[PDB]
Amino acid sequence: XXXXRXXX
Amino acid sequence: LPTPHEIRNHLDDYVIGQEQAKKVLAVAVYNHYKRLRNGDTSNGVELGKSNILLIGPTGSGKTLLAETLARLLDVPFTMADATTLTEAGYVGEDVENIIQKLLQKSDYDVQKAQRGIVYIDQIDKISRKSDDVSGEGVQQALLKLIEGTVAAVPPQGGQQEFLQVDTSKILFICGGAFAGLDKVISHRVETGSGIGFGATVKAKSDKASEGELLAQVEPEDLIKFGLIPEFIGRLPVVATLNELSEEALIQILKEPKNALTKQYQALFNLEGVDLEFRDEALDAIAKKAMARKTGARGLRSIVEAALLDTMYDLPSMEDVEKVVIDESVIDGQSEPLLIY
Amino acid sequence: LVPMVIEQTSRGERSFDIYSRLLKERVIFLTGQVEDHMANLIVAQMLFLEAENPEKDIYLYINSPGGVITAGMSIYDTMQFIKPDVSTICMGQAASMGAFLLTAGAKGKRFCLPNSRVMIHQPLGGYQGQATDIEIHAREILKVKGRMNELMALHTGQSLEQIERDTERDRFLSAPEAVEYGLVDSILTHRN
Amino acid sequence: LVPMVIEQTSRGERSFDIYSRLLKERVIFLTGQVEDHMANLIVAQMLFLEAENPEKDIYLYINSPGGVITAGMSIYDTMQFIKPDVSTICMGQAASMGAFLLTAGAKGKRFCLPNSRVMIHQPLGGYQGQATDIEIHAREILKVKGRMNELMALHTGQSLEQIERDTERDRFLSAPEAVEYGLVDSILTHRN
Amino acid sequence: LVPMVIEQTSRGERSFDIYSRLLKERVIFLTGQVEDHMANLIVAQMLFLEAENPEKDIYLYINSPGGVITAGMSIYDTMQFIKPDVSTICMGQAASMGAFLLTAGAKGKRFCLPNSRVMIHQPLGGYQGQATDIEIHAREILKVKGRMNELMALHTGQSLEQIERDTERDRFLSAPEAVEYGLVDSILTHRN
Numbered sequence A: 001x002x003x004x005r006x007x008x
Numbered sequence B: 001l002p003t004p005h006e007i008r009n010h011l012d013d014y015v016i017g018q019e020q021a022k023k024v025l026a027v028a029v030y031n032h033y034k035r036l037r038n039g040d041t042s043n044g045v046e047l048g049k050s051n052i053l054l055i056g057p058t059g060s061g062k063t064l065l066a067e068t069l070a071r072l073l074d075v076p077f078t079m080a081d082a083t084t085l086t087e088a089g090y091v092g093e094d095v096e097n098i099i100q101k102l103l104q105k106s107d108y109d110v111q112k113a114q115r116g117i118v119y120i121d122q123i124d125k126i127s128r129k130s131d132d133v134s135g136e137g138v139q140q141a142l143l144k145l146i147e148g149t150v151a152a153v154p155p156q157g158g159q160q161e162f163l164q165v166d167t168s169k170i171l172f173i174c175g176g177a178f179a180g181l182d183k184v185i186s187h188r189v190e191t192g193s194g195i196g197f198g199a200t201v202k203a204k205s206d207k208a209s210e211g212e213l214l215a216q217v218e219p220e221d222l223i224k225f226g227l228i229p230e231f232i233g234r235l236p237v238v239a240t241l242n243e244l245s246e247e248a249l250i251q252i253l254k255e256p257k258n259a260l261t262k263q264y265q266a267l268f269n270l271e272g273v274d275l276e277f278r279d280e281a282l283d284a285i286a287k288k289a290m291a292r293k294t295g296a297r298g299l300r301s302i303v304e305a306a307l308l309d310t311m312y313d314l315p316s317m318e319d320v321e322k323v324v325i326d327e328s329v330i331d332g333q334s335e336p337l338l339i340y
Numbered sequence C, D, E: 001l002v003p004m005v006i007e008q009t010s011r012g013e014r015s016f017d018i019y020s021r022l023l024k025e026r027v028i029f030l031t032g033q034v035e036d037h038m039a040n041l042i043v044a045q046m047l048f049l050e051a052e053n054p055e056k057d058i059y060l061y062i063n064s065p066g067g068v069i070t071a072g073m074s075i076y077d078t079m080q081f082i083k084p085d086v087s088t089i090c091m092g093q094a095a096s097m098g099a100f101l102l103t104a105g106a107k108g109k110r111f112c113l114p115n116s117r118v119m120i121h122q123p124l125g126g127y128q129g130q131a132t133d134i135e136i137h138a139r140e141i142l143k144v145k146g147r148m149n150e151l152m153a154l155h156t157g158q159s160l161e162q163i164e165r166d167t168e169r170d171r172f173l174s175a176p177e178a179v180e181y182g183l184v185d186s187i188l189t190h191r192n
C-alpha cells in the first residue's frame, strides 16, 4: 500500500 | 549442437573488425553449453563456470555480439545497466531487480532460465573511489551472485509462493569501457612517457590504435583502476576490442546483411524503384561519426536527417526509377540527383 | 609561487605541484647554481626512481651556470652507480660542471637543443695562508683537473691531450659543434 | 597573496588559486624579469599541457621588462619543438627578450594590446680580466646578437640587414607599428 | 594575516579568505603601488569573472599611490576589452595612474568617496647614457604623456588642451570637484 523508503 | 567455426561465421556476418573477440566468445559459449547438456553424469562433478569480461571502446559492438548471439542461440537475453545500482538498500537500486529481468523474457522458466545469458554495461562506473554506496561496496554484493546461488522470484508477479532458480549455470558477460586505462598499462609494460622531451608524446591519438596495448592487459593492472582482485578472479576470460576504423564503417554498411544501406534498398524494391549508395558518400559519414565521438551508434542520425526530404517526396514523385547520393549531399550543400 | 595541477586518475582527483608531476614520470630538473643543498636534493630523486623501477630511463634537464665541483661529482657518481640510463638534455646553458654531467649521461640518450650553449673551462680555486698549505691545495686541485679531463675524454671519445688544450681557457661550443665533438648524440629540433 | 576560486565540477567542489585555474585552460603567465628559475617553471607548464592535449592551442601572456638571454632561449626552443601552436599576447610591455618570445609564437596567432609597447635593442654584457678572456666573451656575445637577429627576421619576415640597423639602439614600437612590422598579426581591441 | 570566513551554502560549509569571498561577488581590490606582479594578478581576476558571467557588473576599489605606467596600462586595456562594465570606486587616494584607471571605468558607474582625493601629474622617468640614447627615451616618454592625455580627455570629456595645462604639474582634486570635472559621476555618501 504505502512504502516508507528512506536512506541515511 | 553448433561449433566454434559455425558460430564464428554467423558472428562474422553481423560483426567485423574483431577477430580475437570471436574466438573467445565462441569457445566460451561452446564449452559453457556443453556442460549443460552433459550435466554432471561423468566422473567429474560440480563443473565450474567460466565467466566473460569484455573491455573495449564505446560503440565498438560489445552489445551487438551479445544480441546477435541470442538470436542464433535462441536463449533468453537481458541488457542490464550497473549505473543505477546502489549498495544494498539505498535509494537508487538493489541487485534483486536483475534476477527478475532475465525471467521476464518468457515469464515462466524452471529448467530454461538457468541456461540464459546476461549483459552488464558501464562496469567501470563502480570503480572503488579512494578519497561508499557507488564504489567498492557494490562489487562485494555481486561476488555471491556470479558464484551461483538461488533467489526467490514471484513468477509473473502473481499463490503464497516463490520459485527458486539457480544461477551457477547462468553465464554473465560484464561489458564496459575503461577510459584512461592506457596510462596505467603504458608505464607498466611499454614505456613511461607522454610528458618528457625524449619521451613519446601522445601524437598517435587516431593515427595508431590503442588496442594493441590493451591486448597486453592483465588483472594486476585492473586493481589499480579500482576493481577488487576477488571480483576479477571470478571472470578469468578476457576479451579486448581494438578500435573502430573508417574503412570498417564502409564495410559495416556493405558486408553485413542487416546494414542500414540495405534496408532502404529493400524498402524501394517493392515500390519498383532502384536505390544507390556510392563509395564517395560513405567515407563522409565516417568523418562525421568520429567527430561526435559516438562511433556507429550516432549513424542513423546522419542518414535519416539526409534522406528526410527524399523519402517525403518519393511517393509524390513519379517516373523515378533510380536515386543517386553524393558526398556534397551529406554535407547539406547539394540535393541528391534523380533519374527518370 | 608554484602552480598546482590536477592529475585525472580512476581512483579520484589529486593535486600536484608542477615539479612533482614531472617527477612521477622520471624527470628531474637541475636549475641554478650547483651547491651542496641543491645537489643533495637531486640525488634523493634519482634513488627514489631507482627503487620504484630500475629498468625505466630517467630524463635530466639541465639549465645551470655551474657551481661547486664537489657538489656536482656526487650526482655524476650516482648516475653511473644506478642501473637506469640517465638521459641528459641541455636547456639554455651548460657550464663547466653542467657540461660534465651532460656528457656523463648514457651513450645514445644525450641531446642538446638547437639554440643551447655549452661552456667548458678549468677548475677555479684559491687559498690564503702559509706557503706549505698553498702547495697542498694546489696539488689537490691539479688532481681534480686531471681527473675531470680523463672522464671527459672517456665519454666524449676525444684524447686526453685534446681535452687538456681545449680546457685551458673558456671555450664555447654551439649545438652542432657538440655533436661533432662527441659531447652529445643528436639535436631535438622538432618533435616527430 | 593569491585569491582562491571554486571550480564547479560534476564530481564536486574544488578550490584553486587564480594562477592554477588559468593553467587548466592552457594559459601561462610570464611576469617580471626572465631568469633561470622563472624560465624553468614555464617550460614545465608547456610540457604538462602537451601531454593533456597536443592539438589545442596554448596562450602565453607576456608582461616583462626582459632579462637573461640564456633563460629566454630555453622557452623559444620549447615552443618550436612542441606540436601545439603557442599563441602570444603582449600586455603592458615587451622588452628585447620579451619581444623575441612574442614574435616566436605561431604565425597568425600573435596579438598586441591597443596600448601595449614593444622595445628591442642589442644584447648587453661585460667582462673584467685579461685581454685574452675579453676577446673570448666578446666573440660569444657577437654570435648571439647575430643569431638573435637571424631568428627575428625569420618570424618577422624582414631582412637581416633591416634588423641589424633597427637593433643597433633601443627602438620602441607602438601597437599599430608592430602589425606593419610583421611582429604581430592583429590587435584585440574588443571582444567580438 | 588574512581572516577566514564561512560561506553557508546548501552543499555544505566552506572556508574562504576575506579577499576570495569578495572575488566570488565580482569585486577586486587594487592596493599599494602598481607594479608588474600586482598588475598581472588583477588581470587574471578580471578574465576569471568574464567567463563566470559576462553580463554582471564588476566593482573595482582603488586605494593606491600609483606606480609604473606600463603595469597600469595592461589593466586599462583589459577593462575596455571585456564586455562587462567595470565600476570603479576611489578609497583613500588615487594618484596619476590610479586616476587613469578610475576615470577609465564605465560611464555612469564611477564613484568617489566624500573624503577621497585624486592627484594627477605628468609621467616620471630618467635615463643615463649617451646623448643619442637620451633622445630616444625622451621621445618615447613624450608619446606616452600625449597618449595619456588623449585618453583622459576621452573619458573625462574635457578638451586635450585643458588636460595638458592641468597635468603640467601636480594637481589635487577633491571629491566634489571631480564630479564637475567629468572624472566621476556621483558620490556615495550614504546607503539609500
Ligand SMILES: Nc1ncnc2c1ncn2[C@@H]1O[C@H](COP(=O)(O)OP(=O)(O)O)[C@@H](O)[C@H]1O
Binding pocket: B014, B015, B016, B017, B056, B057, B058, B059, B060, B061, B062, B063, B064, B121, B175, B177, B252, B256, B296, B297
Ligand atoms: N560490426 C558492426 N556492424 C554493425 N553495427 C555495429 C557494429 N559494431 C557496432 N555496431 C553498432 O553499435 C551499436 C551498439 O553499440 P554497443 O556495442 O552497445 O556500444 P558499447 O560497446 O559502448 O556497449 C549498435 O546499434 C550497432 O548497430
